[PDB]
Amino acid sequence: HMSYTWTGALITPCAAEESKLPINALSNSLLRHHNMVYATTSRSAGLRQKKVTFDRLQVLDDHYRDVLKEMKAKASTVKAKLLSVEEACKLTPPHSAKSKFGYGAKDVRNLSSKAVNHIHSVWKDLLEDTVTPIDTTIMAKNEVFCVQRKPARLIVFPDLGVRVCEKMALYDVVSTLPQVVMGSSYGFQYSPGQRVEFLVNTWKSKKNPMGFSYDTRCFDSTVTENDIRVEESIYQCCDLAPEARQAIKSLTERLYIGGPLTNSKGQNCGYRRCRASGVLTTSCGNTLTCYLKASAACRAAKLQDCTMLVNGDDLVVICESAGTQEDAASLRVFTEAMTRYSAPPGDPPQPEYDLELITSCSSNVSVAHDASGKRVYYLTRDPTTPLARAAWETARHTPVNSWLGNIIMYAPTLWARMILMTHFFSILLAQEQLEKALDCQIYGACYSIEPLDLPQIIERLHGLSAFSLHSYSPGEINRVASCLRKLGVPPLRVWRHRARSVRARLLSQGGRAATCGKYLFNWAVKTKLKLTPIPAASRLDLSGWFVAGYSGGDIYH
Ligand SMILES: CNC(=O)c1c(-c2ccc(F)cc2)oc2cc(N(CCO)S(C)(=O)=O)c(C3CC3)cc12
């Protein structure tokens, strides 16, 4: 019962891959220790293949089937619609990988007849054939990290035509079902501000709160055929159009449960029997499956008043404490239950008695103070990976601008405000590209965003306090400072100095540029302006934003 079988054909690249940090005239203004930053390449895919390849065994008990019955009871209340071809086509990213069959993402988005004709033929075939495995391309991801080296992650995805049909059958399902089935535990529903609020209120809801993060070793590889059938049975509880049901069963049999792996050069690389990383249902399936198993394991471990927070394969549980020694015992029982369900941990879970000491999705809760002095809670992280990618993006144009994503999702943080906003607005001012829309990612979904609209977006995801936070905590300041020394990034005082320059330059352009200077950089100056609610922030249609996650899902807004 192996996650993968392999032929020995290599996972080949699509193009030239750089492993070393590109340097330009801007590089040393951000980061001087360039040998610390690297990009993963297909060269390391061979190592990743070994890591992700193992036997899965599953022992399913009454807690499991009990939780699944409840999950299905809530699933049965969901009505989901089929998307039209044209609705699905406009959800396709502009630089989504082109079809093998003679069209690309822009053909799809323009509703070109060749594209649409092929998509109708793929759909007709899904309705007619519920057995034939669907081909997938396997590729190494190119992502940037700091040293102390990870191997390349693997992306497995079907043809463009198939991807549009997934949207047609399942987009409304994966968008509406997870909140209904999991309620407040479904993490992708929250803005970062709503998410902190939920965590703190949940932490406060307990008499003696304890919490842990539970992170599964190679989650996609732990997902069995049973797990993918159980997900399908949940989707099928929904009130669906008959073609949707058939297409969902076809996509499950032929794509989701498994299939042949082909490289970029067309060679058969092997065969998948676990989760594909680049299908529509990756995030939702993972979130459901992770919730099912973890809720069941809570019951096996008799944890009092478990609150789950689940996003994909990331899981935090906050529950009632039984004292440190017994909590420790209980976590091992939790871990014992999860492992039996084929979800063992990378690192064993540790109980925590301070909300700020729990880390999941690389992030933790911390505290600062707003204008009035009142404490505000916010999500932050070690800035190392964000900064290493900022350094890469200073010298190379990338299809996803992590700096922009990081400004949006960590806008209230010290390091995003002082370093990322300062640095990238300076570059944008110099190139006169403040109004140029840039592709970025929030919860795995693709967004095209104009840097000038950041103040609006930040106010909506965080509120006006994002522009007013101060008196950050000694622990947080310490981590950032230490990261800046390790990477060879100038100290925070240099950034305050440059921010005043950036601020004045932005004000000197007037308009939306001036708004950016006023709101984003008010922290930089001594005589603080008063920051009132932004007129335009109310106008912005933030629907699609924070209903669900779509990591690997090939979704654009
Ligand atoms: C189950 N885990 C969670 O819900 C998350 C926690 C977390 C929870 C409890 C805790 F004690 C410490 C941290 O922090 C997060 C940050 C992000 N973001 C970053 C995505 O990498 S963000 C800052 O955009 O909100 C996300 C995004 C993926 C939805 C999810 C979580």
Bridge partners (DSSP) listed for residue 376: 368
Distance, in Å, from the CA atom of 114 to the CA atom of 105, rounded to the nearest integer, reads 12
CA angle 543, 546, 548 (to 5 degrees): 110
Q: Indicate left, alpha or beta for 323 from its phi (over 0: left) and psi (-120 to 50: alpha).
A: left
Torsion of Cα atoms, 217 then 219 then 221 then 225, to 10°: 130
For the record, the structure tokens of 194 come out as 């709503």
Instruction: Kindly state the DSSP code that residue 468 receives in the 8-state scheme.
Output: T
Contact 549, 287 (CB under 8 A): yes
φ, ψ at 278 (rounded to 5°): -120, 45
What string of DSSP letters covers 530-542?
A: P----HHHHH---
Least Cα distance to 289 among 261, 308, 304, 272 occurs for: 308
- CB neighbour burial string for 273-310, b if at least 16 within 10 angstroms, e if fewer: bbbbbbbbbbbbbbbbbbbbbbbbbbbbbebeebbbbb
3-state secondary structure string, 55-67? Answer: ECCCCCCHHHHHH
Whether 366 is in the pocket of ligand 1, judged by its Cβ within 6 Å, is: no
Instruction: Kindly state the DSSP code that residue 489 receives in the 8-state scheme.
Output: P
CA angle 32, 38, 39 (to 5 degrees): 140
Binding residues for Mg(2+): 215, 313-314
Whether 381 is in the pocket of ligand 1, judged by its Cβ within 6 Å, is: no
Amino acid identity for residue 218 in this structure: C
Which atom of ligand 1 lies closest to the CA of 410? Answer: 23
Instruction: Kindly state the DSSP code that residue 98 receives in the 8-state scheme.
Output: P
3-state secondary structure string, 233-293? Answer: HHHHHCECCHHHHHHHHHHHHHHHCCEEEECCCCCEEEEECCCCCCCCCHHHHHHHHHHHH
Distance, in Å, from the CA atom of 517 to the CA atom of 509, rounded to the nearest integer, reads 10
Whether 290 is in the pocket of ligand 1, judged by its Cβ within 6 Å, is: no
Contact 3, 274 (CB under 8 A): yes
Least Cα distance to 314 among 375, 378, 379 occurs for: 379
- Side-chain-facing half-sphere of 392: CA atoms under 13 Å: 27
Distance, in Å, from the CA atom of 380 to the CA atom of 21, rounded to the nearest integer, reads 25
By most ligand atoms within 8 Å of CB, the mutation choice from 184, 319, 379 for ligand 1 is 379
CA of 284 to the centre of ligand 1 (A): 16
The enclosing H or E element of 127 equals: helix 113-128
Contact 351, 210 (CB under 8 A): yes
CA of 329 to the centre of ligand 1 (A): 26
Binding residues: 215, 313-314
Distance, in Å, from the CA atom of 161 to the CA atom of 531, rounded to the nearest integer, reads 48
Instruction: Kindly state the DSSP code that residue 343 receives in the 8-state scheme.
Output: -
Contact 297, 28 (CB under 8 A): no
Using DSSP's 3-state secondary structure scheme, residue 412 falls into: coil
Which atom of ligand 1 lies closest to the CA of 199? Answer: 9
CA of 129 to the centre of ligand 1 (A): 40
Residue with CA nearest ligand 1 atom 11: 358
Contact 200, 377 (CB under 8 A): yes
Least Cα distance to 361 among 153, 196, 540 occurs for: 196
Whether 416 is in the pocket of ligand 1, judged by its Cβ within 6 Å, is: no
Residue with CA nearest ligand 1 atom 14: 363
Distance, in Å, from the CA atom of 418 to the CA atom of 439, rounded to the nearest integer, reads 22
For the record, the structure tokens of 440 come out as 């970025």
Distance, in Å, from the CA atom of 80 to the CA atom of 296, rounded to the nearest integer, reads 27
What string of DSSP letters covers 24-55?
A: -TTHHHH-S-GGGEEE--GGGHHHHHHHT--B
Distance, in Å, from the CA atom of 554 to the CA atom of 279, rounded to the nearest integer, reads 8
Residue with CA nearest ligand 1 atom 21: 361
- Side-chain-facing half-sphere of 541: CA atoms under 13 Å: 4
Residue 388 CB contacts under 8 Å (≥ 6 apart), including other chains: 31, 36, 37, 144, 145, 146, 487
Contact 174, 283 (CB under 8 A): yes
Alpha helices (runs of H) in 146-252, residue ranges in sequence order: 160-182, 192-204, 219-222, 225-237, 242-251
φ, ψ at 300 (rounded to 5°): -60, -40
Using DSSP's 3-state secondary structure scheme, residue 88 falls into: helix
Q: Strand (E) positions, 282-384?
A: 304-311, 314-320, 363-369, 375-381
Name the class of domain 183-223+281-361.
alpha beta
What string of DSSP letters covers 201-229?
A: HHHHTSSSEEEEEEEBTTHHHH--HHHHH
Residue with CA nearest ligand 1 atom 25: 192
Instruction: Kindly state the DSSP code that residue 144 receives in the 8-state scheme.
Output: E
Whether 196 is in the pocket of ligand 1, judged by its Cβ within 6 Å, is: no
For the record, the structure tokens of 316 come out as 């935090």
Bridge partners (DSSP) listed for residue 260: 271
Least Cα distance to 261 among 26, 7, 526, 51 occurs for: 7
Q: Indicate left, alpha or beta for 284 from its phi (over 0: left) and psi (-120 to 50: alpha).
A: alpha
Number of H helices, E strands in the chain: 22, 14
As annotated, the residues of the chain forming the CATH 3.30.70.270 domain(s) are: 183-223+281-361
Instruction: Kindly state the DSSP code that residue 334 receives in the 8-state scheme.
Output: H
CA of 388 to the centre of ligand 1 (A): 20
- Class of residue 344 by CB neighbours under 10 A (exposed 0-12, middle 13-18, buried 19+): middle
